[PDB]
Design a protein around this ligand. Structure first.
Ligand code: DGT
Ligand code: MG
Length: 595
DNA sequence: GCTCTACGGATGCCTCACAG
DNA sequence: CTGTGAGGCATCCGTAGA
């Protein structure tokens, strides 16, 4: 019954297809691109194929008129009417960049359902899905020359069948409400983030690169003079020589975090550390971005377009190649220059970067999950828990806690929460093994609800094989009952961390979706992204709790109000989700906006 | 006895042509 | 006949963000 009839061949047939399509509560949509060139209509994208069910596929050719594209735009932009596509983000970007079509409404992606049912598994290709979840369609795998009219039909029907199976599988696991309402709208928001791209000035990048390269030459001159000869800084053998071979205390694994008893006294290891950061910064941001930089003519600027992965074990969002998330924070260079690779990321003319970062997000989520009344009452009163942790660690007043010293407190807190042992805590605090063990013991005793939550999460993981987040995501950890102690402990730490961190990721995704909905309510006429062609915000980057939006100068205040309200009202918990909003002329130049 | 990501570089065995 | 350099991947680790 596998049919590939072409609806876009007759006027009346196409009209009947459209009128039956607008009433379909759930259909499957597939791209059909004959990519003769690497983002066009009739040259790259050839058409769209549809599938309502019962092994039926209808093809809408975008080749040799525009009324078909107009009606497809009407159907795809809020015709119920859930459209399921394979790799929704790339499909959304292709539709936008080829025809300016925005998928508005309810969208679904079988990859997202497969990753919900097994976050730690491998990213199943569509045939891999048909060979696992829906074996009853294997003979249809033939059809993926490519002939994008047949590959699209086969992909659409297979995606429809696979998503129908995954719908029942999610209903069994009680993830369908989370999948339909939170996971997929977050994917559409990430597609909008990829379409927008983050602004990027080469002029700032060029001057930062020039200063960094001058510093690299100076550092090489120092290192070749500090030791006595001219070695190679990119080969581990040379660093394992001189250091650990002449005077320094230890093949030898010359890496970071051995700063103790090495970086003091002889200053060579500090120079090597600075050289390695600046070199990593260059070769992983500056060079990759200066070759991945693209020119937006309408904005008359340069933009970096990242690619989101979203197949994360804990529910986070990552980015490949450009790695805008991993762009380093500002660091100082002495003769003093300030390498701010984020400062190279800029809004359009007459616009401002707006960044809203969740304040102690995972602490609040852990307080809600554990129902720990102590933590709840501490963090509902406006107190900064990380500041107090740093203060009690160092004995200084909490109001005088450095941001760098607060990062160590954050690391200590989250590590203790997520299974850090006594040796690692001693390393990260400088205290002895016994002192670190007593610190973890008193931490669990003080926050009784948190320790009870950890033990109960481990026990329920052993009983069920999986852990669950605040909004229903399950991660299966078969190693929880493994006989080997190391694997069992790793699975325990992963279980607790997945619970809390996946809950935080769910909260962040829902906050992003709510912000986007409110922004579209407030600015219905604004463009959805920078590739749809001003007013509103644009969501140029996501930092796992932080949302960079790149708003207009006059709309800054209203956008900040909207963003703060939505990030605080995303989910109703026993905690308050205090969001910290900053604005500035650049990503690397942001000032706190107490609004 | 922190977790997550990507990613490149590094190990670390497994196997195949191969030259003796 | 057979060790074997080489290659061939398969993962592990370090490092930057979070
Ligand atoms: N296990 C672990 N998770 C971390 C660590 N640093 C950050 N994370 C996770 C937990 C945080 O809730 C989440 C968001 O990142 P941030 O570092 O910006 O922290 P948060 O928003 O919690 O606090 P702050 O923003 O400083 O008030 O990242 C770390 O050192 N260890
Ligand atoms: Mg934060």
């Amino acid at each position: 019954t596998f049919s590939i009839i072409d609806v876009a061949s007759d006027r009346r047939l196409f009209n009947t297809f459209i009128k039956e399509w607008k009433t379909k509560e759930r259909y499957s949509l597939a791209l059909a691109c004959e990519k003769r060139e690497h983002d066009s209509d009739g040259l790259v994208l050839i058409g769209l194929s549809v599938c309502w069910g019962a092994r039926d596929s209808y093809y809408i050719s975008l080749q040799q008129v525009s009324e078909r594209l107009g009606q497809v735009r009407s159907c795809l932009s809020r015709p119920g009417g859930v459209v399921v596509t394979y790799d929704i983000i790339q499909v959304y970007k292709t539709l936008v960049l080829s025809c300016g079509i925005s998928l508005a409404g309810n969208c679904e992606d079988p990859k997202v359902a497969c990753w919900l049912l097994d976050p730690g598994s491998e990213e199943r290709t569509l045939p891999n899905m048909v060979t696992v979840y829906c074996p009853e369609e294997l003979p249809l795998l033939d059809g993926l020359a490519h002939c994008p009219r047949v590959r699209a039909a086969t992909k659409s029907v297979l995606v429809h069948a696979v998503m129908n199976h995954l719908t029942g599988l999610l209903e069994k696991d009680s993830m369908l409400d989370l999948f339909r309402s939170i996971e997929m709208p977050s994917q559409v928001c990430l597609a909008l983030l990829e379409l927008n791209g983050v602004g990027f000035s080469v002029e700032e990048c060029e001057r930062q690169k020039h200063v960094m390269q001058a510093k690299l030459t100076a550092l090489e001159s120092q290192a070749y003079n500090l030791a006595g000869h001219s070695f190679s800084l990119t080969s581990i053998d040379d660093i394992a020589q001189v250091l650990f071979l002449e005077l320094h205390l230890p093949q030898f694994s010359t890496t970071k975090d051995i700063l103790e008893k090495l970086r003091p006294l002889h200053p060579l290891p500090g120079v090597i550390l600075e050289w390695r950061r600046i070199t990593n910064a260059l070769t992983k941001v500056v060079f990759p971005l200066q070759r991945e930089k693209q020119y937006h003519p309408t904005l008359a600027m340069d933009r970096i377009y990242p690619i989101a992965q979203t197949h994360t074990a804990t529910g986070r969002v990552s980015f490949t190649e450009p790695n805008i998330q991993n762009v380093p924070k500002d660091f100082e260079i002495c003769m003093a220059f300030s390498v701010s690779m984020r400062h190279a990321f800029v809004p359009f003319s007459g616009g401002m970067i707006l960044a809203a970062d969740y304040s102690q997000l995972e602490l609040r989520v852990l307080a809600h999950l554990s129902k720990d009344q102590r933590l709840l009452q501490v963090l509902n009163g406006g107190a900064d828990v990380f500041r107090c942790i740093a203060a009690e660690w160092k004995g200084v007043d909490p109001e005088t806690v450095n941001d760098s010293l607060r990062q160590q407190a954050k690391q200590i807190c989250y590590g203790i929460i997520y299974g850090m042992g006594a040796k690692s805590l001693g390393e990260q605090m400088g205290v002895e093994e016994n002192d670190a063990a007593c610190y973890i013991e008193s931490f669990k005793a003080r926050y009784k609800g948190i320790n009870a939550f950890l033990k109960e999460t481990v026990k329920n993981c052993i009983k069920n094989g999986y852990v669950q987040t605040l909004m229903g995501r399950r991660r299966y950890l078969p190693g929880i009952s493994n006989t080997n102690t190391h694997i069992k402990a790793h699975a325990e730490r992963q279980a607790v961390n997945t619970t809390v961190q996946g809950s935080a990721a769910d909260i962040v995704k829902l906050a992003t979706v709510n912000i986007q909905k409110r922004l579209r309510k407030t600015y219905p006429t604004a463009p959805l992204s920078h590739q749809h062609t001003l007013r509103g915000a644009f969501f140029v980057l996501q930092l796992h709790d932080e949302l960079i939006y790149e708003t207009r100068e006059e709309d800054l205040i209203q956008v900040a109000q909207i963003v703060k309200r939505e990030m605080e009202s995303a989910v109703k918990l026993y905690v308050k989700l205090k969001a910290k909003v900053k604005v500035g002329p650049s990503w690397g130049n942001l000032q706190d906006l107490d609004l």
